[PDB]
């Protein structure tokens, strides 16, 4: 499958490419319905 592991600094464009969305609230879960 893979034959090497390359390492380098990450550009902001790359960091946005990894992500599936932006976290905007410090919330974790609801305190009664323990749902996200």
């Amino acid at each position: 499958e893979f034959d090497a592991i390359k390492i380098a600094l990450a550009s902001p464009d790359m960091i946005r490419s990894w992500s599936f969305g932006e976290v905007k609230k410090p919330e974790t879960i609801n305190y009664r319905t323990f749902k996200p």
């Binding site: 976290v23 905007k24 410090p26 974790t28």
Partner: protein, 50 residues
């Protein structure tokens, strides 16, 4: 993860992420209030620390 008895166990990274997000949101809100530059400088220092 939920534990027995209603207790919850959490990783320390959640605390650090919550710190970062709180200070970032506060900074964004404070930029829109045109606060005195002392406040925004201190907020930026806090964000850097977090």
């Amino acid at each position: 993860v939920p534990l027995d008895g209603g207790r919850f166990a959490t990783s320390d990274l959640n605390d650090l992420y919550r710190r970062v997000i709180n200070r970032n949101n506060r900074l964004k809100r404070l930029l829109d209030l045109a606060a005195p530059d002392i406040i925004v400088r201190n907020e930026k220092r806090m964000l850097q620390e977090a």
